[PDB]
Design a protein around this ligand. Structure first.
Ligand code: ATP
Ligand code: ADP
Ligand code: MG
Lengths: 128, 288, 457, 192
């Protein structure tokens, strides 16, 4: 799953060629989810293909047959305009973190933590 | 000042503490304004100073030469500053009278331009307080027409003997065109009062009660430090210089430097020297 | 410790308001004053967060400091604790002329800064629920701001996020792909370059094996332009053919190496273009797409000669994709109109239009094929983009000619906006600036950052 | 520090205020003419490596006009067409040096298009050219009019600005130029 995730068709008709080549990739690679998905629905996937904020509009009939990592496989093949929030909520569910962002960087907070055995290396960026 | 003289001339000036040929040969590289000096009838005092074209300004008191060299170079510095200070006061004192003090042989251009700008400033800040006063715009137009007409009285003779300083006129025309454009834009926007920022955007040359100048932009102010420049080429006031002057004066108000930049061949190097000219400092251009 | 900007909107506001101290904000005179401080905070946050989209919200990555923000706080201190009735004008006047415009070189980014400065002295109204001088309410409205950010808060269209998330997702996937893991010249890491060249030029041996005569100025100044164009094109094509024949013989043949062969090989292995090729003509950073564009223009200029030998270059519909230097072509039209009219060349103008043929101009040529982004073009009206708006929109054709000055232009002066006409998506160099009929409310069309590209490919 | 943008200066405002300051009266027309000449010549003529149209070339041509009007009032009288006739020579004292043959002809065709009938006037002086042909006669070279034109051109540039580049390929006569202008000037002029 992870290798075809990182990259290592006359049957669908309502999709673009750009997604159709990845459909062919998914079909040759993993035929199991291809069988479990039933891609010729055109009823629920028509609804999923049209929502905004489509990370949570999953068809709830299949909400117990598809894991969290396989939903992102669905997202990458269908619509790559969602992957950043998709990864974000995947990580937030698996780790329970309320945000993928960190806290800010108050040096008045990180004054009291340090100690004179080791020094403090402040990496800069342009404009810092 | 000796950090820019080499050793080779510095030990000359330390040794040759009375030789006039040494003084006229090496006092030029010390003070950039003075090109040469005169001497009195026994070579014991210095009484005047020159320029590149021969602009001559007398000193208000004689300068005693001696052996200890700093003990008359300090006298040169103080007496030059006091001479320009009293000469500015005398010029502005006659100029704020009703009659014109037009006598351009009697003053260097450094005091003419400054007196005209100070009197312009005080008159316009009377104006916008009182009335919109197109009379002052018409007065500036007629005054500029008068200067351009008198310019044809020296252009036809040209090269004469003991007559120069057509340049004092040409270094005055540009400031008058600047004042023309300022009053015309104040007319186009119809500013109400003085605290309106379209006036305090413009560069102001006030007078202090200690009779010395105080160049003041938006809130930052400086002081005129009486460096004698002599005749030099000034610049046309493009609106890019508005940007440059305001950034550098705010940066000096915050106690920082100033880094103008951009592509090659614009005017950033001479703009700094132009600001130093309009302010009264001395500028020591380097290379790194 | 990495010491950078916060990665989000309300993160940036939280960092800002943590960096403030409350005795600064809590003055006696309260209500109209701290709201301006919040406007400065939102303005600083907005101008920083535009930088995530390049070259859209800014053309370069301009360095904005916290010292700039503290200088602006010094300004608003000396204004409000200055006497009475602070003019909103000179706040943004001094602010553009000293602080934030002192980073800016291009003019259109100055225009964008002017628009934000004019706008923020009112908000996205539903997300903005401001309060009184109570400091922790200023803290709490930041949590009322949502987690995820929207370009509708900024002004960009919605296809921006589509292209951005496609590219950023491919970046992070390749970066996590990294964490998992002379013979190459004798191998085939560079064979598809030569393979694309052999597909471009296998039936155009005249188009890389003919010699035009070196020519001087003829009668009309549009003939000389196209002849020099032809000469430069054939020269660059044959130079490319030599530079590829050498690197072909050192691989699939029997010879040895020079240093310039190593330079070509190093640049093409890193898949950048060599400096010798960019000395002549600026192209795309893809060398493959570079060879594509070059051979396309090589076909084109011969067709341009064939239809311009007969002075029939006025009638036919032509396209500016095929000119290596199109502004020189347009200034050649300037000379022919200034010679045909009987007026000096300095006293003309350049206006194009869409609502019919030019009347007062001397010549009329049909230019189409332009591409537009940041909006959705229609005749007489610019319309805002949508969620499902495609990125590249084609355009209605145009009529271009040269008009004498102080004549009646086809469009009224206060209904149009000037748009740059760049060369490709990189937004590098400006050809001209055509006016497009807006019809009021121009500031939205500023903050979209509308552009116009001469072509692609 | 505190950075300042100084990217683009103006060209019409400076050129009109300078000419109005330097006694010339018709600045508001001719300044725009100068700036349009700069923009067109930079814009359509073939982009060689070594050309320039910066602020320095403009500041040169303005003093080149101020000097000619400084001569032609103390040495004579003033009238109409000479006042717009001067600026063509005061521009071609600089701009002629850079060009090739054909680009100089096309530049002349552009000068005809901005100024309709005020086309040409050549080098005023010849008594130095007699000494120059004398020194060529002395050192057993030949006498080519092109070398004469380039040497008189060099003397013009050396009077005009501070530094001169002499671009040329190998052996094609670019050092004999100053080498003979040395003696040809030194026979009358002071010390070289
Ligand atoms: N008037 C002339 N008639 C004939 N030959 C001449 C004349 N003037 C110069 N030459 C020849 O031209 C040759 C080269 O002269 P010159 O050194 O100026 O060329 P150059 O380009 O400066 O050389 P380099 O390439 O070393 O810089 C000399 O050998 C000289 O004999
Ligand atoms: N505002 C101006 N008015 C008149 N001349 C100017 C002005 N600005 C620049 N110049 C001229 O341009 C030339 C170059 O200016 P400089 O400051 O040296 O620019 P750079 O350092 O980029 O070469 C100078 O000779 C100067 O006289
Ligand atoms: Mg030589």
């Amino acid at each position: 799953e992870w290798d075809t995730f990182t990259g290592v068709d006359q049957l669908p008709s309502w999709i673009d060629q750009e997604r159709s080549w990845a459909v062919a990739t998914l079909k040759i690679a993993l035929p199991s989810l291809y069988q479990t998905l039933c891609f010729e629905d055109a009823a629920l996937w028509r609804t999923y293909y049209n929502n905004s904020m489509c990370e949570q509009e999953f068809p709830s009939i299949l909400a117990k047959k598809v894991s969290l990592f396989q939903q992102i496989l669905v997202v990458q093949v269908l619509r790559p305009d969602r992957l950043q929030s998709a990864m974000a909520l995947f990580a937030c569910k698996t780790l329970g973190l309320k945000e993928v962002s960190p806290l800010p960087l108050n040096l008045k907070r990180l004054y009291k933590e340090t100690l004179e055995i080791e020094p403090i290396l402040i990496i800069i960026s342009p404009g810092a | 000042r000796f950090y820019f003289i080499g050793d080779d001339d510095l030990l000359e000036i330390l040794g040759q503490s009375t030789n006039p040929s040494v003084i006229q040969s090496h006092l030029k590289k010390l003070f950039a304004g003075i090109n040469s000096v005169c001497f009195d009838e026994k070579s014991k005092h210095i009484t005047a100073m020159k320029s590149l074209e021969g602009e001559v300004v007398p000193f208000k008191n004689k300068v005693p030469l001696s052996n200890n060299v700093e003990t008359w170079l300090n006298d040169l510095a103080l007496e030059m500053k006091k001479t320009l200070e009293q000469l500015l006061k005398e010029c502005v004192t006659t100029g704020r009278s009703s009659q014109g003090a037009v006598d351009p042989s009697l003053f260097p251009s450094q005091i003419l331009c400054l007196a005209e700008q100070i009197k312009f400033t005080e008159d316009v800040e009377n104006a916008i307080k009182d009335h919109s006063l197109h009379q002052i715009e018409t007065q500036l137009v007629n005054k500029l027409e008068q200067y351009t007409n008198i310019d044809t009285s020296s252009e036809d003779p040209g090269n004469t003997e003991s007559g120069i300083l057509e340049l004092k006129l040409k270094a005055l025309i540009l400031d008058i065109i600047h004042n023309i454009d300022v009053v015309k834009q104040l007319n186009q926007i119809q500013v109400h009062t003085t605290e309106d920022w379209a006036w305090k955007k413009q560069l102001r040359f006030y007078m202090k009660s200690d009779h010395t100048c105080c160049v003041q932009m938006v809130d930052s102010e400086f002081q005129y430090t009486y460096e004698y420049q002599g005749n030099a080429s000034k610049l046309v006031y493009t609106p890019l210089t508005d940007k440059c002057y305001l950034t550098l004066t705010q940066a000096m108000k915050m106690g920082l430097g100033g880094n103008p930049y951009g592509p090659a061949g614009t005017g950033k190097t001479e703009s700094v020297k132009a600001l130093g000219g309009l302010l009264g400092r001395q500028v020591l251009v380097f290379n790194c | 410790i990495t010491y950078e900007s916060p990665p989000g909107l309300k993160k940036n506001l939280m960092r800002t308001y943590e960096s403030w101290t409350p005795e600064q904000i809590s003055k006696k005179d309260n209500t109209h004053r701290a709201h301006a401080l919040f406007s400065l905070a939102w303005f600083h946050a907005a101008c920083q967060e535009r930088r995530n989209y390049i070259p859209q919200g800014w053309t370069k990555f301009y360095e904005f400091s916290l010292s700039d923000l503290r200088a602006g706080y010094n300004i608003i201190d000396r204004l409000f604790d200055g006497a009475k009735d602070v003019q909103w004008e000179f706040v943004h006047g001094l602010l553009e002329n000293a602080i934030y415009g002192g980073r800016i070189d291009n003019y259109f980014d100055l225009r964008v800064l002017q628009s934000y400065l004019k706008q923020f002295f009112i908000f996205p109204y539903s997300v903005s629920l401001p309060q009184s001088c109570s400091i922790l309410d200023y803290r709490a409205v930041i949590e009322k701001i949502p987690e995820d950010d929207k370009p509708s808060f900024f002004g960009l269209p919605a296809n921006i996020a589509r292209s951005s998330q496609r590219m950023i997702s491919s970046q992070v996937i390749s970066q996590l792909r990294i964490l998992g893991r002379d013979r190459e010249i004798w191998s085939n890491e560079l064979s598809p370059v030569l393979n694309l060249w052999k597909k471009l030029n296998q039936n155009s041996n005249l188009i890389h094996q003919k010699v035009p005569p070196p020519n001087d100025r003829q009668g009309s100044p549009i003939l000389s332009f196209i002849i020099l164009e032809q000469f430069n094109a054939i020269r660059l094509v044959q130079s490319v053919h030599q530079s590829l024949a050498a690197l072909s013989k050192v691989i699939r043949g029997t010879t040895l190496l020079s240093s310039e062969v190593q330079k070509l090989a190093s640049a093409l292995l890193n898949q950048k273009c060599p400096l010798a090729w960019q000395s002549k003509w600026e192209g795309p950073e893809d060398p493959l797409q570079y060879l594509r564009g070059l051979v396309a223009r090589a076909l084109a200029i011969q067709n341009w000669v064939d239809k311009a030998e007969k002075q029939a270059l006025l009638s036919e519909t032509l396209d500016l994709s095929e000119l290596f230097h199109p502004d020189t072509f347009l200034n050649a039209l300037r000379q022919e109109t200034a010679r045909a009219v009987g007026r000096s060349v300095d006293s003309l103008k350049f206006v194009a239009s869409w609502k019919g043929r030019l009347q007062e101009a001397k010549l009329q040529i049909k230019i189409s094929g332009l591409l537009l982004e940041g909006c959705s073009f229609d005749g007489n009206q610019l319309s805002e983009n949508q969620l499902d708006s495609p990125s590249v929109s084609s355009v209605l054709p145009c009529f271009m000619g040269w008009i004498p000055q102080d004549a009646c232009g086809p469009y009224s002066p206060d209904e149009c906006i000037s748009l740059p006409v760049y060369t490709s998506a990189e937004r590098d160099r400006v050809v001209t600036n055509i006016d497009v009929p807006c019809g009021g409310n121009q500031d939205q069309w500023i903050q979209c950052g509308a552009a116009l590209f001469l072509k692609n490919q | 520090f505190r950075p300042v943008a100084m990217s683009h200066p103006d060209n019409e405002l400076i050129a009109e205020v300078i000419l109005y300051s330097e006694g010339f009266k018709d600045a508001k027309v001719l300044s725009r003419k100068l700036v349009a000449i700069f923009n067109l010549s930079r814009e359509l003529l073939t982009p060689q490596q070594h050309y320039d149209w910066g602020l320095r070339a403009l500041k040169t041509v303005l003093r080149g006009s101020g000097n000619l009007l400084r001569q032609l009032n103390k040495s004579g009288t003033t009238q109409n067409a000479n006042e717009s006739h001067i600026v063509v020579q005061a521009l071609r004292l600089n701009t002629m040096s850079k060009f090739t043959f054909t680009d100089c002809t096309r530049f002349d065709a552009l000068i005809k298009d901005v100024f309709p009938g005020i086309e040409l006037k050549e080098v005023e002086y010849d008594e130095l050219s007699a000494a120059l042909k004398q020194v060529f006669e002395e050192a057993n070279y030949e006498i080519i009019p092109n070398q004469i034109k380039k040497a008189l051109e060099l003397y013009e540039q050396l009077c005009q600005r501070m530094g001169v580049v002499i671009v040329g390929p190998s052996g094609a006569g670019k050092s004999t130029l100053w080498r003979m202008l040395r003696a040809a000037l030194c026979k009358t002029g002071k010390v070289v």
